[PDB]
Amino acid sequence: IFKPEELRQALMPTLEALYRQDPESLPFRQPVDPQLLGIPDYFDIVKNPMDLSTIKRKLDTGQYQEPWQYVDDVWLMFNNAWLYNRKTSRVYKFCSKLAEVFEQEIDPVMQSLG
Ligand SMILES: CO[C@H]1CC[C@@H](n2c([C@@H]3CCCC(=O)N3c3ccc4c(c3)OCCO4)nc3cc(-c4c(C)noc4C)ccc32)CC1
């Protein structure tokens, strides 16, 4: 219902705001690799992986038809990390910071799109 360029122009700054977060975004900039990490149970627990680079690609390639699909992918990323990692880990606390940032950025944008 939305043109892919309008979605990208409006939404990409909110993704850029996540990428700008250092150290917090670094573990989220590429898909979780259970082979490199030695965690063969990762895809048992996380059935639908998501990360910043995959969200960026879906914006870049026109895979979102409406902006709540983008918001849902961002929250899928967050919920995957909170689900798999322990609350004392960097990834878990880093994820919480990304959620704080995203909440503030996505707010005016979703209003502007609808
Ligand atoms: C810049 O490419 C690298 C980024 C980080 C690396 N990676 C590591 C490493 C494994 C070595 C031992 C260590 O200590 N790692 C580490 C952990 C956190 C870091 C960090 C390094 O450096 C950047 C800031 O935070 N574990 C990770 C866990 C996840 C993850 C998420 C999200 N959901 O579920 C899981 C499980 C994702 C990436 C991970 C992988 C390539």
Author numbering: 1084 to 1197
Provide passages from the article that reported this PDB entry.
EP300 and CBP broadly regulate the activity of other proteins through their protein acetyltransferase catalytic activity. These proteins contain several highly homologous domains, including KIX, bromodomains (BRDs) and HAT domains, through which they interact with, dock to, and acetylate target proteins, respectively. EP300/CBP are critical gene-regulatory targets in cancer, with existing high potency inhibitors of either the catalytic HAT domain or protein-binding bromodomain (BRD). Using crystallography, we identify the binding mechanism of the EP300/CBP-specific BRD inhibitor CCS1477 in complex with the EP300, CBP and BRD4 BRDs, and define components of the CCS1477 catalytic binding core that are required for compound activity.
Since recombinant CBP BRD was more robust in biochemical assays and crystallization studies, Kd values were determined for all compound-CBP interactions by MST, and co-crystal structures of the CBP BRD with five of the seven analogues were determined. Notably, replacement with a dihydrobenzodioxine moiety (compound 7) maintained high binding affinity (Kd = 17 nM), and the cocrystal structure confirmed unimpeded positioning and interaction with R1173. While none of the analogues were superior to CCS1477 in terms of binding affinity, substitutions were well tolerated if productive interactions with R1173 were maintained.
